[PDB]
């Protein structure tokens, strides 16, 4: 489930962040905060698609939901 997040993945996240030395409970804490993040994002994304009356969430709606959380991301037609 949430345990599909591997330890070296969050380690690579530290590496692109540039972080050297790693503790223990970091892993489960990371999975939790990532979960709540995706929860709010995909909730309002599916809200957009609910108004769309269509069965597939658009990439557009993902982009606009990111704008709605003030998390504006370019690149994919937004």
């Amino acid at each position: 489930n949430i345990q599909g997040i591997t330890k070296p993945a969050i380690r690579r996240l530290a590496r692109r962040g540039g972080v050297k030395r790693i503790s223990g409970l970091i892993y489960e804490e990371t999975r939790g905060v990532l979960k709540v993040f995706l929860e709010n994002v995909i909730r309002d994304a599916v809200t957009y698609t609910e108004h769309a009356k269509r069965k597939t969430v658009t990439a557009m709606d993902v982009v606009y939901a990111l704008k709605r959380q003030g998390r504006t991301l370019y690149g994919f037609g937004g």
Binding site: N1, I2, G4, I5, A9, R12, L13, A14, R15, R16, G17, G18, V19, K20, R21, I22, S23, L25, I26, E29, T30, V33, L34, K35, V36, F37, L38, E39, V41, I42, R43, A45, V46, T49, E50, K55, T56, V57, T58, A59, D61, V62, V63, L66, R71, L73, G75, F76
Partner: protein
Amino acid sequence: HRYRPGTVALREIRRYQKSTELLIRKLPFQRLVREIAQDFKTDLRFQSAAIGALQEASEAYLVGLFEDTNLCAIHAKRVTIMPKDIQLARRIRGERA
């Protein structure tokens, strides 16, 4: 023989500041996202480009939050991260009350 610790990590920091390719690979991330949305609604075929968008935004988000957490720990007269550091950084940004 055995190398002395800390070195390989920083060397791969210098390596991993180069390619902006996605760190979490696709299928398990996709399963996690699907298992999440399902909790909000059913029968929602995801555009794959939207999945890549979610993946990009999530990874950059977590990297930046790691940067602030790392600088918190550097301020904390230490080198290793702690979960309380993540709590401090989040308490500054204001996700949780």
